[PDB]
Amino acid sequence: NVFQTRAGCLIGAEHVNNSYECDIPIGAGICASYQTSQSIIAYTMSLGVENSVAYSNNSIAIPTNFTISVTTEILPV
Amino acid sequence: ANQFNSAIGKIQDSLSSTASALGKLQDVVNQNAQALNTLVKQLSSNFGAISSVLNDILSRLDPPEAEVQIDRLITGRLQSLQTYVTQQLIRAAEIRASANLAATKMSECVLGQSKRVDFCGKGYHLMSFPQSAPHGVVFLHVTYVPAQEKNFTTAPAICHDGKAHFPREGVFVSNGTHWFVTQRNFYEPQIITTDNTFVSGNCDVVIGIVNNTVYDPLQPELDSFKEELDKYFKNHTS
Amino acid sequence: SMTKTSVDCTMYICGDSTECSNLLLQYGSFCTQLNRALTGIAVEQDKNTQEVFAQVKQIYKTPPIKDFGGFNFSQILPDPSKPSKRSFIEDLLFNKVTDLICAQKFNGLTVLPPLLTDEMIAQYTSALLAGTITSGWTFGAGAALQIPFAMQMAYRFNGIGVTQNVLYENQKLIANQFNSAIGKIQDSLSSTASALGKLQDVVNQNAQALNTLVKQLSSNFGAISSVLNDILSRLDPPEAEVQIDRLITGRLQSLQTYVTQQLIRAAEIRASANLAATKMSECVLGQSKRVDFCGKGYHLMSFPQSAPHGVVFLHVTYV
């Protein structure tokens, strides 16, 4: 469990090549998360699910359905 | 009705199960709590002197040696209190900045309708519900978001008599056979008419224009009544 | 964002001194308040990148077959042939913004690396560029909706009061005006390197603050000598505690002055980050009708660009 990066030597964590959504940040693009017989793993942060929208001259997408979403924002005063 | 009532019910389930959503307000109380605790703990430090109790310094050391030792705590506790005031002035600029940002959301999102993008929250803003919170305010934002979509075939213009026709409101769509005019935010198929489009330019100045037949709502009404005019004057000549 | 710095009270004031370490315990928790203040700054500086650079949670890409209607986006779009993802405009943005770091780390000043690296910043920018070119204003307020780019400017003109018939007739004229305007950006950034001085001043204020913080250690502050080995190895233990106390009091005020100065600059960088984050949603993601907000003229579309310790906005307006 010895791994080095730009943030320095990190002991007690396993290196994973896959990229998921983590919790405990580290730095220099390397993060940390508790995942599966479970331990702490360190891996490069994931940038989100890749969605490639098709583009064409005559192609257009008009939504046929809608939804009503309610969000909560807490601003201190 | 089922979309709004179910969304409000999820608020009670989110606030009860997750207590960290209000952490924005808990950080204000915890910040002032750590500032008051540290400010008191500085009273027990000697500050390079013999003792931290000024009553013991006066009751033991001589008057000439006491004024030097007592001055060490007075100077130290003064700098420790200036540090507290300095932190409070800095934290005041943070809480007043969030208050000015909240005062703007009360006017634009709640009182009126704000067309700003992602100011009232993600999606197209509709109506905002203010709520009371300790040392703060909670905002409930009702927004309009699309759900499902379908790929359509569009055209920049419709060519009929040789003059280009452009949509007044909405965009052109097609299922592969008929060309319809629908809104961008919602799909409402409508027959292309002279009332929904306007004539500008010609067909040669538009790149990608397609040929179609623009239905004139005045055409069949006048023609059917024109046949009443032809048959009437037919009796005039008979 | 600004450079993340961390300063320890023990090594900065008096290092390798056991007697001075006990004298520091007499002044209480002052280390805790100075360490948590500098730590809180490094956390808020990372939050500025999450509220500005990070906007949409989905990664958008450009189609292989590109017909934009005469526009050339190769300047704003990143170059896949390079080992790191960046565009032609971001080439001049990074090169015109200016070891000193290693020398400051020798005196006990720790420079923490940022959580969000430079490679991920350009990906967030490329995701917002590829989305605006394709999905237009749809992906910001909801699910991504594919729309022809020629139909996108038609709605952007109808929002400012211009009938879309102007676009189809002037499409050849607008193609030359836009491509020539983007070409002036590369000529302005290469010839004039002072347009980015707003970001260079942020680095200069940090360089002057870190260097002056170290230069205060060479001053004696009214004591016998600034070197710890000079006082401890000469004067008696009762006499040395008085002279070292003069070094502690002086170096503590110089350290509290730096922390107080950085907390003030931390409030200034968050004010500009909130102003930049507001332009991300209104000018870039959507279309803002505000006057002199997205820039002079009637706003149409905004193209964000990655920059070191900042962000560059490219606004397209109707004049």
Residue numbers in the entry:
A (entry chain B): 641 to 676, 689 to 729
B (entry chain B): 924 to 1161
C (entry chain D): 730 to 827, 848 to 1068
What do the authors of the reporting publication say about this deposited model?
The spike (S) glycoprotein of SARS-CoV-2 mediates receptor recognition and viral entry into cells. It forms homotrimers protruding from the virus surface and, once engaged with the host-cell receptor–human ACE2, undergoes a substantial structural rearrangement to fuse the viral membrane with the host-cell membrane. The S protein is also the primary target of the humoral immune response during infection. A large number of SARS-CoV-2 neutralizing monoclonal antibodies bind S protein, especially its receptor-binding domain (RBD), providing a basis for vaccine development.
We determined four cryo-EM maps of the Beta S trimer engaged with ACE2, including Beta S-ACE2-C1 (only RBD-1 up), S-ACE2-C2a (RBD-1 and RBD-2 up), S-ACE2-C2b (RBD-1 and RBD-3 up), and S-ACE2-C3 (all three RBDs up), at 4.0-, 3.7-, 3.6-, and 3.6-Å resolution, respectively. Overall, the pattern of these structures is similar to that observed in the Kappa S-ACE2 complex. In the S-ACE2-C2a, -C2b, and -C3 maps for both the Beta and the Kappa variants, the up RBD-2 or RBD-3 appear also to associate with ACE2 if we lower the map rendering threshold, indicating a dynamic on/off of ACE2 association with these RBDs, in line with our BLI data showing relatively rapid disassociation kinetics between ACE2 and the S trimers (koff = 1.00 × 10−2 s−1/9.34 × 10−3 s−1 for the Beta and Kappa S trimer, respectively). Similar to Kappa variant, ACE2 binding to Beta S also induces a pronounced S-trimer population shift, facilitating the transformation of the S-ACE2 complex to the more open C2a/C2b (64.0%) or fully open C3 (27.7%) states, beneficial for the shedding of S1 and subsequent transformation toward the postfusion state.
